[PDB]
Assembly symmetry: T
């Protein structure tokens, strides 16, 4: 259905934007605990790319047309823009946490309709939520107060 296709397209553009932001932060981060932040951003980008590809193949299987162009992503993404200069570790961790939370929350919005329509795709969304939440936890644990 066109509604299902549109929801999956909104998820896909958010995943692509998240991957691009992760790579940009991976390149442009400075500060403490550099090696771990560097490796974690790479792992997150790999996982996000794999999830985006899986969504693309599934949505193709359901006979929909994907929209993953750069202009389309820039026009329809929901993630906030990222700073273009070198950033401290606390700031980049905070920004990554916020972006991951927004990406997860969009999927949590669409989950009800996706489960009502196709449990097979609901399972892929469940796996994506699991992976993204694990990544978000392991990153956000750096800046915890206690």
């Amino acid at each position: 259905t066109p509604e299902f296709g549109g929801n999956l397209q909104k998820v896909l553009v958010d995943l692509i934007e998240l991957s691009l932001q992760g790579k940009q932060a991976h390149w442009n981060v400075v500060g403490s605990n550099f090696r771990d932040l560097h490796l974690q951003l790479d792992e997150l980008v790999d996982f996000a790319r794999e999830g985006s590809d899986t969504i693309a193949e599934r949505m193709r299987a359901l006979d929909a047309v994907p929209d993953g162009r750069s202009d389309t992503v820039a026009a329809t993404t929901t993630l906030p823009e990222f700073p273009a200069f070198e950033r401290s570790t606390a700031d980049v961790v905070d920004l990554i946490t916020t972006r991951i939370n927004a990406t997860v929350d969009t999927i949590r919005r669409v989950h009800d309709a996706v489960d009502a329509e196709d449990p097979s795709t609901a399972d892929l969304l469940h796996g994506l939520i699991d992976g993204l939440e694990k990544q978000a936890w392991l990153i956000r644990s750096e800046n915890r107060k206690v």
Copy 2:
């Protein structure tokens, strides 16, 4: 130097645009001889991602500031936009060949200044142009009729 940083930034944004659009074509292509294009476009995307990461790390080592944001890519890329909807294999082969030719032409234009300033970065450009030209040959040989 800022001009050197800008010359590398143009290459970086071109590679990111190429990778995203190659993934788009990988998801979207249908028609005769589908599987060969489906696999080779994935290989092209992998190579483009590796090259973009290599350029980002090298230019960071040379103390410059990357701009890999989606908005920046959309605003300052040189590759023409990818047409939407399902496309035939011949058309996608032609479009990918033209775009890879544009990218390698950009590499050729920047190569003079890059070699004049840093031979180490010139070597990375040589490797990238070699790989991209090999990919371009393997793609365009599909549509050749002799």
Copy 3:
């Protein structure tokens, strides 16, 4: 739960019959773009065998009695018979697409009944839908004209 056992037996019989047809077509197919089909049918057979074994072991865990005999498969399968001679690639692609469609439609009918009892087996069926539909798309894209 005799109804659960019968439903899972109907699933397994169709999976085994489809695997046999896939192997026969893999051995028999010939024509334009032969190699891609030759490899993809092998991949589909491997996936079908993995799914059939997984279903059989799950249904064993639930204390049911599987029936995987050749006579039982031939007597209780739902998929149509396959041509016995050399077939063109377009025809074999169409036949394989029809077979995958019938198999996934069978799981679609049994889905609600099996989810009424066991969400765990529902998850396995979701995975089978994901894989089979991905294979169906990747094969049917061969004959698509647009």
Copy 4:
């Protein structure tokens, strides 16, 4: 959410107790099919450890605090204690079957609440039920007669 944390803590403590008791049986089992039981119990312990780690990371990523201390396990576990000395093969198979049945029963009680609140955790619990039931079948098949 505190109730959710409580159910997940019960799951984690049951899994930890199962792993410890399985290692006990692994070191202690003597009798016929000794090598078979030795390998299978090691596989069961490995799977239980993987599942316990997955559950712990999931619930802690959902902002809960795990309690996997030995005193907590002893005080709040639900599995009955293991024999103290060398046991026959049939007896240890029966004991392990009973332990796995109790664990999966607890998971089944928790399943309703987890499906009510977080489908992502429900999916992990489904996978755990699948793995534990497969192991239980493979173990209990030793003692079953015709």
Copy 5:
């Protein structure tokens, strides 16, 4: 030659029947020494599937048409029909021994004509014979007494 194709088709259909028999027994076997029988039957199925695929590819290379449909298997198989329900260890090992012996006996009768016509295919037949005989030894040696 048509007679050569007929003998190779007989061997192929026998191997397919053996693979189906092995998988069914693998799923269904219950009793003593169960884990080892479970692993050995899976190994036998893997070997039988590889041999059947090898014969199919060879006969296709020699310009013959294979017949691996389930209906054809049921109509032209030579292995006697297998029990329907759960069976003890002695019964299953004895039955598997009888089917393997029947298969190798059929291959033995075909071997004379195959060696008369094509020694290259005769070598593949020899490999199948001794692999199957090794598997038969490992299986029947369980029931043997002193």
Copy 6:
């Protein structure tokens, strides 16, 4: 001898308690320099589990009876308990260092009695010292101030 068996059982209890407490710390740790501790405590738990299994199998080979039940561990362990809530990274490093020091000092007491009978087991005890002391240094170096 029963005294040797009791000493080995006491060592095994300490190893199991250390592994469980390490997993607790791995789950519950939070604060600055997270990922390093998160990976390193997992490595320590893996090594401790390997050592505990090896020592259990060795003591079984020497014809003794292991006691690895949760109640037995809680009743006869020597390592003091772990905090039940989220702790700072410096504190968890200090506690883990203390636990490892207690465990290795227990081995230091038991070593003379072990070597008085069995140099082969003394070698395994030496290996345990090597691994645990390397891990202890690798953890304690976090808070070292020169």
Copy 7:
């Protein structure tokens, strides 16, 4: 000595086939290009392995190999290959014809080589199997029905 001569004739044909496969691998264009490109590389690898196996076996049987380029050019029986870009159908046809000639000479030598040494007969049987499988797997592209 005749045994050595037959094995030398086999070896030069295998080397020529490997060179033919590499040439077609580099110089092929048209439809199904990626599949033909991979298949020809696999065939070249198999031909090189078979040539090595024959060379080492015949060395073990105390003969003197002749695998020089001049010797191959003077003694091989495979037809000459075109030196320009060729369509895929023509490439498949030419490769099929060359493989058929190569397996034909092996079948011709098989009787004497098996009568003299079953161990070498086994290696030649394996080579026949592999090359015939490759021949079918390539020639299936241009089949009519």
Copy 8:
């Protein structure tokens, strides 16, 4: 030292005899738990071969002359000769247990002089004792009753 050479020669000849015994039993064993015995005897043969090679290379490094000839082994080894025909499971397990016990007893007598002269070789002896005793446990634990 000639006495050192003689002790290590006795060790080597005993290891070679044990390897031959294990391989013969591996080929010849028939009865219950056949596949487990077949795998374990192969593992024991592999371990014995590795240990024999290690002892030979160590003794050669210490400027002695190894004697691994079959005639020397037959004339010098202390392990009693094996049955010549097919043997039952209990009998072969008992025979292997007795052979391993004799070998480790010989190693124990030699270990005193070995530790007196060269601790480096004493370490290898300890490793061999550990491995052989573990294998002996996995063997003799088969026939043990409660």
Copy 9:
């Protein structure tokens, strides 16, 4: 087929004696070009062990009883005894060449009688000839002068 069994026993005895002599030379060889011989004799022993195991399992599959005892191989082997002291590289090369020639001569002599009954075993004999003759060529080329 007692004659067949005796022939296969003669093959097995020769292979075992060859492996033992190869290990002895591998331990004892010394002189110019030492390392190449040291590695190649190890490879020869590995191949001989593989061949001996293959022959033993094949003759077990043919319902025969092998005799691989040390006394049996010493009293039945045909290979000449090996020097017991340090030997020059040329001498050990000559001795190994002679031993391999005797071993392959035995197989060539028994080949006609073997093929008179079982072509599958004849195939294994062909493979053994191939491997042993390759090893013989590599050994003999060391001392060749031209």
Copy 10:
């Protein structure tokens, strides 16, 4: 350009001739220190084949026509012919060194034009010079006497 195409064609035919030459020497060489040269020539052949394939793919990418036919190689090669029959190792090393030096001389002669035209291809020639010179040293230092 045709002159550049011919410049690379000379390199290609020289590499193919070198590969066949190395294979001939690998098969034919006998004498002292056999195994070292036997493995080294195989490594040389592998490197030459990889380099020839790389040059062929690059020159295809740059839209030229390879001529790798055996007749073309024989007619236009530059390496001296290899004498037949069995040759001593010293003569083989001398001839291989001379031919590799000739190939490196050809590469160096064409390198000026190649670098003036295409730096990407110049890099490939640099890599080939590195590899071939390393092989030349690793072979020629055999015959060196201080």
Copy 11:
């Protein structure tokens, strides 16, 4: 030429000194963020060893005489002396950054003559500069504050 040999010898001794000093720092680094520095210094040592070996093999191929003795390194190195004892992480990061900068600066000075004489060796120098600069950036970014 002797000048080229000396220019390469200076780079070789600098690389050896850098590798030894990196190992020194790997051993005596303590403080906050220990593990990341501990791993990065090991990676740097591995890269330095690989580069030093590559330079040694290349300069050997070009018929020069290496001087990698400890006395020669101590006498002719250019890197400043590394202070002993345990050092804080900030200080060791600064020291390693300064040393890598000195090494790459020396390589930059020698690059002109190296490129003027042998472009192949210039390529190796380019690769070494790339790797060392990447490592230097990845280490120095730890201490950066923005």
Copy 12:
């Protein structure tokens, strides 16, 4: 204790000097058996580096500080100097044998105090002696007269 630390430092500097001279001989050796010595010395350098790192980690764990600087090695090492020119293979083999003998002599000298203070460290020294003596034999067997 300071004496323990000093002895471990004496061992470490000897290992580092041995590794450096091994690399020098690896680069510098020419003559017969060149490939054999080239591989063997590379293996010895790898082993020496691993052993030196292991000693550094252990003595760090025991709260001591290493001195592995180039100046410290040159001032404190006990190994004789290595020639700086091209040497015959016999001479380099003799020199390496002498160096290994000196290195193992130092460790055997310190072994008494090391065992009196820490059996675990004595075990590491035993392993180092075993490895170094094996390498020493495997090298010096080249130049043996008889």
